[PDB]
């Protein structure tokens, strides 16, 4: 129990499928609980006509309240599932960007620098940044699609994050410019990369 | 093009895969649009770093206005996609229930009525009602999960719809008990199924 949670999900399971799986398990679990409550409600409701006013009242009050509690648990649970998943998606994206930066740096500091190795290490870093950019855009797009007031409030933050990504890209291309010969030789390929990743 | 719209989605593509595909296409489309505006805003920033304060402001309002409009389009669009899809899912559930009911009745009213046929038709019908029940429960579960405020207004409707479904199942089994012999024959298998 406390042990299985330590080991977590087996490696053969991606965060994405693990997330969907968890989401479906909870969907099914809650559907059964709702059904059980609705069934109990129907049973009791069938006897309502032969009850005194006060008992009739305490009876509807009873089920409305149980459903209130269940609605709160379903909602609180989804919120927890969504946060856990969003946090992990973001961390992976950040981890991959950092790993790719390290690799690009090593290629640059090699004695001597191999154009093809530098271009590929850079490509990987740019793709890590494209992934982060798409993540930012998709998140905003999702909020706008389902919640307008929140979209408006995050507008500037999206713009800012996109400028941070743009600056990391320029900073990386600046690292490549400390080796003129190399930069000139790779400019045409890098331009193609920057265009397609847009 | 009005022609392609007429032909619509190939019959082989389910309403589910068609929906997800449309949703993804719109996701990608809006993401590109949003990125285009963000780039212009970023660019307009740099090509204005040496201008007046009030002009840098007027430029901010301008892009925020453009985004306010895009957010509204993205929202109305999702609203339409969702409405269309929900409407088709419900209609298909009703069409399937009715088709299964007709098959059950055809098997029952056959001459003579064959046990094994009536039994398979009954299962298909019960499964159709099971699908409708799950749809009702899932819709409620979903609204509670992502929009608990509006869940409270659904309580009575779900309660009612669930009883409608149960009552329909009981009426249909009643079509069976209307033929004493056949009812006796299938009596034990009918029992196992209920669970």
Curated annotation (Swiss-Prot), chain A:
One of its GO terms (molecular function) is transition metal ion binding. It is found in: Cell membrane. Residues 151-168 are annotated as: Collagen-binding. This is Amyloid beta precursor like protein 1. The keyword Nucleotide-binding does not apply. The NPXY sequence motif found in many tyrosine-phosphorylated proteins is required for the specific binding of the PID domain. However, additional amino acids either N- or C-terminal to the NPXY motif are often required for complete interaction. The NPXY site is also involved in clathrin-mediated endocytosis. Binds zinc and copper in the extracellular domain. Zinc-binding increases heparin binding. No Cu(2+) reducing activity with copper-binding. Residues 19-51, 119-150 are annotated as: Heparin-binding. GO terms for cellular component: basement membrane; Golgi apparatus; nucleoplasm; perinuclear region of cytoplasm; plasma membrane. May play a role in postsynaptic function. The C-terminal gamma-secretase processed fragment, ALID1, activates transcription activation through APBB1 (Fe65) binding. Couples to JIP signal transduction through C-terminal binding. May interact with cellular G-protein signaling pathways. Can regulate neurite outgrowth through binding to components of the extracellular matrix such as heparin and collagen I. The gamma-CTF peptide, C30, is a potent enhancer of neuronal apoptosis. The keyword Ubl conjugation does not apply. Residues 1-14 are annotated as: O-glycosylated at three sites. Changing residue 142 to A: Reduced affinity for heparin. Reduces homodimerization. Belongs to the APP family. Glycans are attached at residues 46, 170. Keywords: Apoptosis, Cell adhesion, Cell membrane, Copper, Cytoplasm, Disulfide bond, Endocytosis, Glycoprotein, Heparin-binding, Membrane, Metal-binding, Neurodegeneration, Signal, Transmembrane, Transmembrane helix, Zinc. The chain holds residues 292 to 489 of 650 of the full protein. It comes from the Eukaryota. Its main location: membrane. Residues 2-193 form the E2 domain. Monomer and homodimer. Heparin binding promotes homodimerization. Binds, via its C-terminus, to the PID domain of several cytoplasmic proteins, including APBB and APBA family members, MAPK8IP1 and DAB1. Binding to Dab1 inhibits its serine phosphorylation. Interacts with CPEB1. Interacts (via NPXY motif) with DAB2 (via PID domain); the interaction is impaired by tyrosine phosphorylation of the NPXY motif. Interacts (via NPXY motif) with DAB1. One of its GO terms (biological process) is axonogenesis. Proteolytically cleaved by caspases during neuronal apoptosis.
């Amino acid at each position: 129990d406390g042990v299985d949670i330590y080991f977590g999900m087996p490696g053969e399971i991606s965060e994405h499928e693990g997330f969907l799986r968890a989401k479906m398990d909870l969907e099914e679990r809650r559907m059964r609980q709702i059904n059980e409550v609705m069934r109990e409600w129907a049973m009791a409701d069938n006897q309502s006509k032969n009850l005194p006013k006060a008992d009739r009242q305490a009876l509807n009050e009873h089920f409305q309240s149980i459903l209130q509690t269940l609605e709160e648990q379903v909602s609180g649970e989804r919120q927890r599932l969504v946060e856990t998943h969003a946090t992990r998606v973001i961390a992976l994206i950040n981890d991959q960007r950092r790993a790719a930066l390290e690799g690009f740096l090593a290629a640059l500091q090699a004695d001597p620098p191999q154009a093809e190795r530098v271009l590929l290490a850079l490509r990987r870093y740019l793709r890590a940044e494209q992934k982060e950019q798409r993540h930012t855009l998709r998140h905003y797009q999702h909020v706008a699609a389902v919640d307008p007031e929140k979209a408006q409030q995050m507008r500037f933050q999206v713009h800012t994050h996109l400028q941070v990504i743009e600056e990391r890209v320029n900073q990386s291309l600046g690292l490549l410019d400390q080796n003129p010969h190399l930069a000139q030789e790779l400019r045409p390929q890098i331009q193609e990369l920057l265009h397609s990743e847009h």
